UniProtKB/Swiss-Prot annotation, chains A, B:
Tissue-specific expression: Synthesized in mammary gland and secreted in milk.
Keywords: Allergen, Disulfide bond, Milk protein, Retinol-binding, Secreted, Signal, Transport
Gene name of the encoded protein: LGB
Subcellular location field: Secreted
Gene Ontology CC terms, in alphabetical order: extracellular region
Similarity comment text for this entry: Belongs to the calycin superfamily. Lipocalin family.
Protein origin, superkingdom: Eukaryota
Disulfide bonds: 62-152, 102-111, 102-113
Matches recorded under InterPro entries: Blactoglobulin (IPR002447), Calycin (IPR012674), Lipocalin (IPR002345), Lipocalin_CS (IPR022272), Lipocln_cytosolic_FA-bd_dom (IPR000566)
Record note on modification: Alternate disulfide bonds occur in equal amounts in all variants examined.
Biological function: Primary component of whey, it binds retinol and is probably involved in the transport of that molecule.
Protein name: Beta-lactoglobulin
């Protein structure tokens, strides 16, 4: 599932990680689990790369991180340069309310439901759950509006 | 949601904790989270109480535990004696394949999908997810057949 006709410039700005799901419990279990990452801001570049500002709990504190996802020939697919080739996939967005994405290796998967506002969007969560229905996810987390306004959703 | 016409004697024997969900991430997050409990065996007593054999990861090892849930005037509701009054609710069972239950305080909630066999029962999981749809759950875990045959689902 990919977003046809994605305009990456229109995903700019503030986002909340309302929900997260992953193929492996260990990817999301603890506050310090590897893919327990809280999106803050998406900053698409003029050349169409994607800078991601996020928070991650590591070494007993809520740390700031900056990821750059490089564009590919497919608008809805980005690459993160590391020891491993990992793909960022944009499944679905309306730009103004929700965005669904997955991070996949070469498989392990973590996906999130991003929303624009610190509110539980049952409709976005329905799109999120329907997107994942056939994906092999074994852990799903969702956050309340109080948590969404805290550093690392504490 | 309670099981009408529950015969507690018919839930005896081997069960697998195929899936678990809870109101609070912290109840299920880590292997050592309080309600990360793996059912082994249900042993109803002649007088209609329920002994539960389970495993729980505590102090760096998979520990054996025995819980007794006392019957109430409602067949599908049991009480666990502690500092807190906690209710065990039997939502649904066919005795031969699946059983859904919740543990609730006075609220925080943890629920499980129990199955008779180390197999992913998509139908039981559908009943589980439909039962929880309006419950305020923020963490959901499910286990693969390999994990289901390991002590504490490692
Ligand atoms: C619209 C796309 C949003 C993408 N958001 C994110 C993309 C990646 C990550 C992320 O945490 O990536 C780290 C994994 N690397 C090191 C392989 C977190 C959020
Ligand atoms: C058919 C009913 C099955 C009930 N199964 C279980 C019931 C209770 C627990 C359980 O872990 O209870 C501990 C909580 N106490 C100390 C308040 C675990 C499993």
């Amino acid at each position: 599932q990919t977003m046809k006709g994605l305009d990456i410039q229109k995903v700019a700005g503030t986002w909340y990680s309302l929900a997260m799901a992953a193929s492996d419990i260990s990817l999301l279990d603890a506050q310090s689990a590897p893919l327990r990452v809280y999106v803050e801001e998406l900053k698409p570049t003029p050349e169409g790369d994607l800078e991601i500002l996020l928070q991650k709990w590591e070494n007993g504190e809520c740390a700031q991180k900056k990821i750059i996802a490089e564009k590919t020939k497919i608008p809805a697919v980005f690459k993160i340069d590391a020891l491993n080739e990992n793909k960022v996939l944009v499944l679905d967005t309306d730009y103004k309310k929700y965005l669904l994405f997955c991070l996949e290796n070469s498989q392990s998967l973590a996906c999130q439901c991003l929303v624009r506002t610190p509110e539980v969007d049952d409709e976005a969560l329905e799109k999120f759950d329907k997107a994942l229905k056939a994906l092999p996810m074994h852990i799903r987390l969702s956050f309340n509006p109080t948590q969404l306004e805290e550093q690392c959703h504490i």
